[model samples]
Target: AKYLELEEGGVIMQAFYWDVPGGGIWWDHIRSKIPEWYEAGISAIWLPPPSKGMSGGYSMGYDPYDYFDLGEYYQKGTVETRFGSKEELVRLIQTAHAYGIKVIADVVINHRAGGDLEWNPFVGDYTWTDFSKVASGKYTANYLDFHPNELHCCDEGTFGGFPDICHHKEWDQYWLWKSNESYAAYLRSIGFDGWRFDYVKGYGAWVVRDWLNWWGGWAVGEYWDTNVDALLSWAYESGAKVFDFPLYYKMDEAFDNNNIPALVYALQNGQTVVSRDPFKAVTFVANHDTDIIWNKYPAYAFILTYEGQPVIFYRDFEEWLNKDKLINLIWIHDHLAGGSTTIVYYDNDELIFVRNGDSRRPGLITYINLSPNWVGRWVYVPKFAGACIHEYTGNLGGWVDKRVDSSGWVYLEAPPHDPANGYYGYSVWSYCGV
Candidate 1:
């Protein structure tokens, strides 16, 4: 079984990358592009962790020390956070809100760092669990509760070598939940509408569910495992979406081998989270943690026109900067993309699929021919048998027009792979608007 695309779908954009410029005005810089982003069909922007961290201006907010200090007071060796002051952050979110884009904050509550070390009787050692001297004065977690002190948790230290929040313990859960509520309230008051939990495996799904319940909005956790069950279990338990690592792992190598079958979005043998539950799947090409897809054209063409919420990487958007295929794919998803997908035609070097849209959304057909020469095929589009369809994507190759025969078949062909003019043998077609 496959999941149907949501008619009310909206795309999310990862607003920053791992090494994005964070001098002082990151918020303002993003704010400057809110209008452009909205126009580009982005419905939400996932901002990085917005709190003060260990490195001050250099911190990405993953090593969070003070969740309360959102660039407000002088702390972490600077008053303004790496992304600028809380005022600037709020301005960006407010502007995003005005542009009809929801703001998702990268919430990193899994651990603490850059804190004073405290001697604990449990481990008979001094551990870095102390945050008493911090400006917030509220990040003081006793060594008795969280990790690295005395607690025995069924956990590992894969989370950037920071102290795990140890939500398995009741005491840790108690304090962390209270702190999360406070911080979530602050973020909500400042117009943050969603969450992106960093390193969710360090904690438990209950913590993710609790925070989402408190904050009451969208959320996707980073459970970086390729096992579909592993991704589905956490997402189902937490009631929050998980990054589709299974799909990504398959996508990672499919392009190299020209393995078009690996892109199957199914549920029985479906290896992707979006296959089991599109609502609980956040599809992404490349993020701060992962390297960019070497061949992003085919990947983007699939995810952008397929199910699940597609997240565009910030660096990829900047480095490649495709206004034709990338931008058009986003627009198609926003307007003319939805319904269950139908595999129209596929071969060793080419593939064609339809989005099978609904009443509101006209849907689209995406054809990708990886062959060295132009490929043509006749596929059945029952819904648009007599309707005329044209290549909607503004590709450098050229636009294609095909009027489906009354017998429910139309000859569709795509340009061959050519990187010279930025055409990689991909075409997206939507119904000619009435």
Candidate 2:
């Protein structure tokens, strides 16, 4: 369905969080902030799990109790998990869609928890088996729906003590397929664009593939691996978009030590999932699980200015006051930087690159310096001959009226530290006009 405009480039905002001290809220708060997010150029939002959890209002929705219960049915001793009622959720999705912003729901299909503890003759013990609502035929839960520890699917794959649904069983698979189909249909009917599959490592890639192909919308999974080969294997097998954890970690290493060469290696040769397939990558600086402090602004500049669909953390975005700069970078990315990238120069503390634009749009040249000293490079800009180029990022604050010569060459330089701001150590230039 092309829920995200890849060529135009898009950014996602991980909208809701409660971790720092921990608190909860109703969807009214989220609904109220939709206009602010849309104006900030947020293409989509990865919303927290809207379904009821095992811990009721306290649960983070990871310990899912009922797939059918989205703060509607009174099964989990509460109506909603601090995210408000189903009506408010529907309103939120509707309002978000109205503003051309998509919503990605978090789907935890790897395991099920908060099951009714009952005696099972097969296992001969009282286990947290069978969902309470499902037992009453409110949805379709059964004994075979969960792994009984007899399947030998334990270890990190078992998801702590929660009963991991045995996808190997036909009955279990059937239930899951039905559940996913219904959920996708319901969300779409309510105005959601797609889903974010949680814990892809806990289950097989094929399972994710099947569900992705079934749902048939923009879907990204949390494959959760910093290894390039492993993440690539999952992408090849599942044919689905995945979070670019490898690139994120590599970025961390590069920015942390002022290693511009390392940053170049990771961006050019790190073999990120997005590097293999641009449409299949969702890039981010820090997610809800990770804290963002040092190097976050530069990280944001890289992701938003570079390739891949960038996702902004709500806390970081708000705390850092990155909305204005992000909006500018997003403008550059969508309007001028959607071409093939070539690394023209790199060193211990500086990296220079160019985005060769196509017939429809002019290209851009960007340089980043991490050292205390300034860096400069002469690079080639395709079709930029005799065309005007201007620094769009305003870090360097200059306009060169001369053209790139017949040889398509242009000299660019970045200050040791941006004078406009001490945040990002980069400067950007774009072809203004002939």
Candidate 3:
């Protein structure tokens, strides 16, 4: 709101934001403490929705009651809280820009304040399906190819969110067009670089295609409940980026078990898709919707970063503190949450994902200390396996004096506790002999 509506526009980078008290201010404090993170390979910050939603409550910040202003009914203060005012939002964005980090706002167009329509009939006017007006929650004849009856009950009983959009023959042609266009315009005018559309498949590919084309910037859609073929199909035709839900679901399964199969691994590989241009699919784990992954897999985010431009959900990074893992999980999301990869090696409870170039070169290797260790074990690292044994602490490369293997496995001891080193005291590293 504080930024000039024009001048700055187009695809902000991909990054994560944690759900903390004081919201953006907490982020401000954290950033102030560690300013290096602003430029430490991070590109964007995906902020939680900042609309006038529920008050003083456990808020993911999605339930919006008012669209225009940050409601006084919510958190009360001279400073911002739910999580802050438009001015605070602008400050956050400005701060990010000052350090070369872009800001992305999480948009919840799929649904809004639960039953506000009961009190305000105007709510019904905004969307396609209004059960009160139309008994079956179907849209008018103006949508694409959808039949009137097919609107309310699709493959999934009801769309997961509020009311499903009726993508009928003419619905997309007329009413939905004006509403979507106006919303996109409003968002662009607010200094927002781009939008991550919630539950896009439920709404329909038609609307997303129009908005992405009209806005002409970075756009990501949530194609939840849709299969790989459907999502890929929509993406190829729509020209809008899709939230990598297929991989997202699989990540949950793999991380929990600490065993990711080749097929599961291949899901994110760029070669799997047949698009004219390589589209960077948005990826993430636990977002505002689900319970933190720390509750399930204690060492998930720390060990397993998204291969293609890893998107660390709101709390995933913060939750990494629980694991005491050496790898800065945030670094995964902040650095490149969605991109291509050259190679990946997985064995037992550990995996090494290499992107950009050879593992021995300027690349990243995520070593998961799965089992608690008193000593070191052999890890058959490929390529740069015998290169200088350089850890984060010693940005200066150190040669390995000795490399040992008991049963055809390469074993190396972890570094001693050094404040200068990144893996000094994390549990994962300490157990690995660091």
Candidate 4:
């Protein structure tokens, strides 16, 4: 992690190439949006898989046909896989790096597709030689490279009929390890800083641990599980950061019903990512699978206001026009909410909290009224003796002046949700003398 500096709160933009006509244009299209993304406080961009997949232009880059082919070789019916050419991919990464946005390539090592199917003399049709043979320039002697068809456990053994690599065999492990290391090295050499491992649970945690330790940079795994304990256990065991699936589920559920106080219950019981390990947490409200397009602002407000590194989906941020509110939340996180978060008050549909500032930063308090009516409470702000606080945004315009006593306490109120008036929630901040 020497190359990465995590002192400042980082936000990620998942530059998902939407499934639409002429969709494989992200390599060129992303370059044009770097300036806007940087201005929107996007510290990094999580790009989709750039390798050549089995379905060529139609593939979303999940089926791995060739590891060496990154939109260069003419083997997968086309050179590119819904993205741009290899040269264009390099240029995209370089351009993003020029604008201070790190590019994270999606690494899929769970399975391989479109293998050479041959009829076995003893047992029937089986893929004797798969994509690995072409990728590594060494043919598999037989179908032993893959896991046997008869298995009981949901060991992540196979994904949609694709040939699963035998992780237990020494030869398979050696080649897979070498291929990943070389692929990671190539990506890093081509200006890609890190990777987002796909289907981490399909294989052993030790494999990812090796890769993460070898690469020695920022990385997040996709251990998509609903159980927070399982996710946390994977994080602690794999020694790699993971996307906060549990938090995403909670956020989706809470916001869909407009229940703000559910956050307090999750946080207090260690059901949230921030409550477990903020340093290893990557929080998000929605993604390609769980698309929550309508409530982007409120969802972003909750994620960006908290401690975990927030990942903003591209569709919600760009196509949906959620830039302004998200940008404000990012600013608040960097400036006022950097300190540890303390829950001041929480009721059925209302929640209030204070982020106490340290010597280097200032403190601020915020309240959320999820109902259609206003909610008020007396919140205590530590080290805020005789200071002036105001609601910088949300509800009552920008400034609603309020004062705290010598004991650092203040009475704050949040307005109701008015769809026509454009008031969903509110945030208050005090620079402590800004």
Candidate 5:
């Protein structure tokens, strides 16, 4: 309640129900969660999909059966994407509006769900296309074939297991492109601010840029894993924020290994190479496809602190699997630390830094222990000038040890105890999303 505590921009919370507890969540049920969302200070709600999706819930709202229905058979959304009937969905949006919540829906343009997975002949009652049905139309079908390159190779194999949406081909283009325009516009008409694109890399960059500019709302996409050079292809000046997985890869490196170099490579890639829109990149720790890295390595809390859009998976943080004290520590780092005097120094499984990214008066600094077994041995940190610091329950304290170098550096010692508890847990920082 705002009466109890008011969040600055409102506590931005996202619930990905495509594949949540108890199979996939019903759209109607999710609408019921709107009250809880408001209570949690969440002003934005992103629904996975509202189209008729695949018959089953194996995929995380990726497979679409029909655009008109929103995938209700699998019980995802009543009309198609299982939140409820169109009326209920409208009600949910209205209710959210009444409480200051903005709704965002998941839009998939990468591929369609229809293949030999569930039925024989690789055809079903509902699918993106039907070779047989097409011939029934004015255009008589003489030749028919499915090419791997046509379906898969175009996106450089970035999105696997999905056949391509042939934008260049006429029939496929008619459905995927023109129809999608109406669907996107419909979301906007229904009060949805924008959409989160699924596997945007599968669709060419030019196509995405044009569509998003046309949609005229805040749009984001799943760029997945692409080098900085490729990220710009999908990123145009449409306010479309692409997820920064490469950066996540680099950050993950800090958690897994202490051997290699280039800890700041993601920043370099983003600033020097990737899309010029630096702030638009959505940095995250874990997502639907990724396993809980925090559960695997408690020390990643340090790395997650400094990154952009520090996404804490509901499961990891909600279950208290990751220590709340550490979570608050990270929240302070991301929200409070002004981009004032930020410096990062690291060697192997250890890093030290004091950064001012939010406010300058009360600055922030952090350390990342890559692995429990991979602790540091006297890494230099420049910002711990005069204050006594507390880290890992004050087990490792830091003070400026002068005369060590030019600006005075803090020498960090190894962690107090075995971090992995003899699990041989070791890995370098990386940006791979699950």
Candidate 6:
């Protein structure tokens, strides 16, 4: 089923990293964790590439090979990639579905590698353009499907100069999918609820737009641009959501350089995709390619309480193991985060934002104090007038209880950020008791 909306409390987990455990064990690894993830209130799991790539077990599946080979065919020097067999993958998705978790498949449709070398008179040289195996299997991507095949030479910015697929959903895309549009449908038939398009900048947005309409599932394309307008424009154009890179960069800047003004400015003005278009924004602090943000709790606190659907990197969940308060943030997002954000308090060392409550869920107030020492403030919560709140994070220093006056005012204090000693600088207060 196509995603109607990421339900108010829904959170997605980027289930794989760049060099996770290999040797045909990844599928089982994720399968075993579905129950834990569901218990943690994660609604979706973004899997790695489903198609086989050039390096087989070592390939992360970005270097596209046979579209039908989901670690099943023996073409890639092995019957299985590092991510196990097709049957194992099917079981993985089934298990996730059994737990009501949506499996978001990673679709690497932009380019193909590991082609058989062939001589072309137009280019007057030998190139890796022959996809004899792919054509021999499912019947797609012949020599002419790639760019510069002695006929058309207008394609630009191809990835790794590999065989760029001709079916990019523009008029010229007919050469690759003229009769082969069934591939996307086949991916849907495999039980994936949506797709995570890899390096979508390598192709046209029209392909992504049409693929979703044809397959009846949601999709997110990695445009990989830091400009908020650039990302917003691409999402609007493709009819697919995008990762909130602009917000991630701004948050990183705030924590790394202690530039609170920049963060406040970005949040106050519409400088982030999540701020401008939360429905189309898949907010994340780090991903497979980026280093982890230094001040992790604040970043998670900001995203989980804000409007957009937040994604937790896999390693951060398993390795840190909730010692970082990751689990509490997820719990808060599930129970109390909803509606719009209102800035209640802002100053030099801290920023307070409250999520106005909705009919279904009571909202939350987040206190972020970046100072090296603890700071306390008296703030007003308009929606939470006379409502009591408690620190849900179980702050290492200690938890605090708060009460709102008849006119919606309360006192709050957040411990300073000191990861080495396990004291976090931020706290999430809610009307419901933890």
Q: Would you estimate the TM-scores of all the predictions?
A: 0.92, 0.87, 0.62, 0.88, 0.65, 0.93
Clashing pairs in 6: none
lDDT of 4 by residue, 57-95 (tens): 887778867765778777667766678788888998888
Report lDDT (CA) for all predictions: 0.77, 0.70, 0.43, 0.70, 0.48, 0.77
lDDT of 3 by residue, 135-243 (tens): 1122222221222244333522234354433444354344333455344454456566766766665555666677666666656666664366677777766677666
lDDT of 2: 0.70
- Residues 1-434, candidate 1: write the lDDT tens digits: 01112224578889898867767789999999888777777888899988898888899888988877889878868998899998999899889877778889898877878777888676688877777777876546667556654557436444666766776766555555445446777778789888888888877788888876766687889999988898898888998888998777777656545767666533337778888788788998888888646777777877888878898888767566575557778877777778887888766677788888867678888888766787778888887888888887755356567788789888877877665656676788878862
In candidate 6, where is summed lDDT lowest over 10 consecutive residues? 1-10
lDDT of 5 by residue, 284-318 (tens): 55666765343334334433444343344454445
Give the C-alpha miss distance for residue 10 in model 6, angstroms.
1.1
Let me know the TM-score candidate 2 reaches against the reference structure. 0.87
Root-mean-square deviation (CA) per prediction: 3.3, 3.4, 8.7, 3.4, 8.2, 2.8
Clashing pairs in 4: 24-82
Instruction: Return the top candidate by lDDT.
Output: 6
The full ranking of all candidates by lDDT, starting with the best, is 6, 1, 2, 4, 5, 3
lDDT of 2 at 194: 71
Query: Relative to the unseen true structure, what is the C-alpha lDDT of residue 358 in candidate 2, on a scale of 0 to 100?
Result: 61
Runs of candidate 5 exceeding 4 Å displacement: 1-14, 21-45, 56-59, 71-101, 114-128, 131-163, 168-181, 237-239, 258-277, 292-304, 323-330, 359-362, 370-434
What local lDDT score does residue 89 receive in model 6, on the 0 to 100 scale?
92
lDDT comparing candidate 6 with the true structure: 0.77
Clashes of each: 0, 1, 22, 1, 52, 0
Residue 64, model 5: Cα distance from true site in angstroms = 1.1
- The predicted structure with the larger lDDT, 3 or 5, is 5
